[model samples]
Target: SRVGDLSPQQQEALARFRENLQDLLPILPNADDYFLLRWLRARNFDLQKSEDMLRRHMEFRKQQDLDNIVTWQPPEVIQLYDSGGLCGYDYEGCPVYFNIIGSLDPKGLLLSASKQDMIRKRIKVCELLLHECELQTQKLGRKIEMALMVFDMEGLSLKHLWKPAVEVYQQFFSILEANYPETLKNLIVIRAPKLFPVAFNLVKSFMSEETRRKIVILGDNWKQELTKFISPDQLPVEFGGTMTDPDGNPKCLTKINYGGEVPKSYYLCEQVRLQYEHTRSVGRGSSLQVENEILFPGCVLRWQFASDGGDIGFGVFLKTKMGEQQSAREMTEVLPSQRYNAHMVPEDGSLTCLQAGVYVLRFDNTYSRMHAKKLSYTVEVLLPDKASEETLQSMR
Candidate 1:
């Protein structure tokens, strides 16, 4: 009596687990179903009755949470023509299309070409194609692949990977600085912190006399770095969902893809992602069909996550020598009305500019909470501010 084998709560927990196990059987694997059955058998539980119960519970759960859990959807699948050509058809979002082209030439004749010449050409083409494919794969996989990485308040962790990203930004900056020095002049201003000390220690020495005036160090947060560079007064800070004060003016606009009638007001700065691609054809189309030979092998991928009524943020920025350019990008936990600080840099591989005056850089971040998700970003006028006005609606 003092130490019971099972309490009422324990029995209820096991019963719920058993119920879930049965309900998930159809959608789950045979191995998982078998595991559940064995556990039930050990407990002398009724299998047939449990299966029935599972069905009922699943139905109930579906009805209860249908609007929340099952409403969010994946991106539309783009159909591609499968002709005998050089690339494979898009498989599993990797963009590794298998081209099925004709084995023979015109008039149903296979050309008696030299194997050596063909091999030589094939090697060159394949090498180039493979390189391009790898690059494309990295690009398409960018958003989805990195989403799984956790970025908390911790700063300067994961230096190995972060440093390379920073260096890439630096190289892009240097390249732009040399090519377009004037453009790099007015757009970017660097700030440094004693703890991290990126701008003054790492980024400043490489700059010219004219670019040094843009330097302004304030606070430990990265937001100050950008704020110092941009005109905060003109843009004004919107302190809704950010880690700090956010520049409310959206640099680029992304159209909403919400299925139903979009609200007249989106609660401002809703994180929306819009994607489009220009297609070309090299094969045949059946009215609504078109064929394109794989010019180069490449990859395109995407990822999705259920919020479960939780907030999440994600983003990517292009680093250049002159500065960083907030590319056509998106994020989960950032919005126009909010401020956020997700800056973590690696010392060895931090942002490296090419020649150093300024470069273009992109900074995109999003934050979401409770009922709505907000995403807002800006094309950084890093190193040189080329077409600076065209890049923004206002300032900061």
Candidate 2:
């Protein structure tokens, strides 16, 4: 029989999808069959729509350069916002994202890095979790790409609902909606405050109806409620569970918190300099496109930009310098064919040029239609260096 219960027709559909997707992404993961089926089922076994979705998924990854995330490390500013932690798996073997949002020192975190940096770190963490799911698929002998997330709001208060945190949360949901579709099995919000409903009302608009429906918010009775779905052993001891240390002592689950702001010395940008630099402001409801100097093949374009105010969507496009300038509307079409694009850009990133051409770096505030943003940015083109390469090789 097929991997899962499937009719002969469904089996044939899976094969067709595999063949078509191979044509789309030549080099893919060996465990891609399960992922392909996820899209196929998402489209209700419609081959054309599934293939279209698959193309979008790959294009999004390519543009965002998410393939690098598995090996990427977060800088100090990001490391300080350690509200998210991987604890245990659910009854169904879906890994749990045990996030204590209330424990987040948002004000302190913003002092070290902009909201965009935090967003990028969140994406990296989620990407890592997706990789873990793939490993789980092998262990469980079943496809397990989705996760069970628990947003613990035990210490949530009015201070935690400030504009900056709200904006970050909104953008977080937007990024997940656009790029990480159908990866969550459930979102269990525990120990929600009385005011949390009001906050959730403001936050719900950012999420899809389907995503909204999957959220299960509880009050102080979360431990009892969570036990209905997850076993006691899988939960933290503080949450009325049997979790313990290796010596059989009851585990003391402490909230992950950096006492205050991370030192300026720990910030990445202040400590290093790159090749290219720029500073620009994006008005509310508008997009600013900056074209880089002609970059040759094998050069790497490194960039870092962050809004002093709200979050801005960022993307990179590579196109031949046009004979004449195009209007802003026409420029929109140009970016979709970009070699690198990030609708949800982190504060800092790098993209390797695979072809020779002038590339466009776009910072978009269009998502925040009426909220203007002030941005500081730098873009550098780094040419290949044989001596540096030789040094690295020798060191290795």
Candidate 3:
């Protein structure tokens, strides 16, 4: 269906979407009907929104260098423990993948690797599946635009809701919503725990209405319901499908990763010496202000920083006038203060400046009466034109 259900008005929009997009962006890699149609569809055929989204996707592609991401290998721990895999094609020749979300150890993974690694790994998987979708369209002689996924929320752990981990997941959601719109045909969530509602509340923020409608949260009979559309041979035994491994292993470990707890040996913070270009000291009962002037409203401020020992109080503040230093009352808080566990896990983040002013990056140790923090960091103010191209790390 939907692939063939194009109206003249919609067709007109598609024509202009391509032309207008070409003005903003040159030739797209594919620039074909099937590839372009999904973007327009995702934006409800609104040319401008689709164009803007496509531009962002291009920036993301360049920033991550995703064109060659397929060849990039993830760490052994991530490959072995990141639960989920593509088993077989569904009844309509669409690919079906399953993920045991709860089984993943977030806290352990964060300690072992940076969040960017996880994001790249995910985007790699997405691109891999997307290529498969392209092939399926030709083999089935029908347009297969999306893949179906089954999420087994049964093994969900409390650490999955950890604040930093939640932020990573939310970021991933936003990336997918913007770049890979309408990529998932349906997300069938089974064995939802009591904690799911609270989790959903946090997750729903970035989920578009169209994406929300695609999620199918099932009851006890989810397996049976799934069987009505997906053949038993295609569905994995883990989800009540009859498929098994060559050795007759029911859980299908070969196909599914079923990520468990990350081992302590792989924790980066434990072994590696942290690196930073500049080092400073924050007084035991005072604060250190690092100011970077904003030239324009759309400029991006990025920072990567860490503490030698214990937590570091960090935030961004704005000074009203161009001056050396101002007290708390004269300054406006851009980002609220937080005691970041930079010693445990180095912090990397960014903020888009909304107004032109002197923005202060503070390593505040005012609350700590005894410990003077050894702060190491690199901060850069990136122009809007060159924003997001430098992805890992940012400003002073």
Candidate 4:
């Protein structure tokens, strides 16, 4: 049997591509034939393109700690109010997942949950679905590499068209489209309201044309139309299928999240801004450097930062001399550069100084020109003993 539907020429391409990726193979969360093949397919079997695509993804996974994403739990607000979950498998063994996207208030949800939480939560769903695809391969004894997604925008209203939420969603959509290429077989959007196009148009630019074509927007008797592709059992009852929650709710509450309005108590933007002592705007294509001079070798340099608009690259550097102005290139790295999900969540860490030096914290927003991030931070050098005893000092 020909392996994985590859022609001899294509097979050779995969081999050459695999050879080039040896350095990345060990660290990749997945490096099997199936995994390698998807990249090749995503890039139309172009060896150079696939390798470079995967290289960026490898760096992405490392920077985001995506492989360890499973351990991070969603916050309570998202746990209860966020929408979407796996419903069933399509007839071909591809997992069928559903998201009730229009069921929540975006501003309320955004304010209540960390942007990191919101996006990582989405990735977690995708990662678990990826695992499901692998398992389907075993049971079906055939390759199952992609999935079917159903987005129910039933209750969408003019109120749901919040700009900030849509922008954040664009980032969420872009992340998956770029990194998880070829994983969505078809995206079936049903009960799309008049406002669906408004949001979709804004976000559509972030998706590839191939993916854009995969979208199927159904109207009028759409429930029956869906049964033409996958059977009734494969879809949730609300989507014109037979699946139901254990409690007999048609919306399948047990497996899916029907997003609800987030409570105001969860709103945290102002609180996070005020709590951090300094605010700075890191413009697109530029970076901000915050320097804290450490006088004692045994002291600890600590910082906590949050961004208002989107994720920002963050790193720490050490300069061995006083008043030595160094670009990011010349400084010694104490913490490697990473794009933090600071917009939704505050990030904090401390490094103990081994020698007195100029410790520079850099907020890098150099990659994209679309959005400038509003950053809030608190950086201080604390002695080793005081680092552990900070609550008592702060209380006084």
- The list of candidate 1 runs beyond 4 A from truth reads 1-163, 184-194, 198-200, 219-233, 239-396
Tens digit of per-residue lDDT, candidate 3, span 223-317: 89888768988877878789999999988888888888888898876323335679988878888888988876756676778887578988899
**Model 2 poorest 10 in a row by lDDT:** 334-343
Deviation in Å, model 3, residue 310 alpha carbon: 10
**Which candidate number would show the highest lDDT if scored against the true structure?**
4
Residue range 12-91, candidate 1, lDDT tens digits? 64566666565465653122322343334323455555455445534643543421422332212101111111222122
Ranking by TM-score: 3, 4, 2, 1
* Best model per TM-score: 3
Candidate 4: the clashing residue pairs are 115-344
State model 1's lDDT: 0.27
Q: Candidate 2 vs candidate 4: which has greater TM-score?
A: 4
> Candidate 3: which pairs clash?
81-259, 102-156, 302-394, 302-395, 303-394, 379-395, 380-394, 380-395
In candidate 2, the residue pairs with backbone N, CA or C atoms under 3 Å apart (3 or more residues apart, or in different chains) clash, namely 276-380
Candidate 2 Cα misplacement greater than 4 A, ranges: 1-16, 29-33, 41-49, 244-396
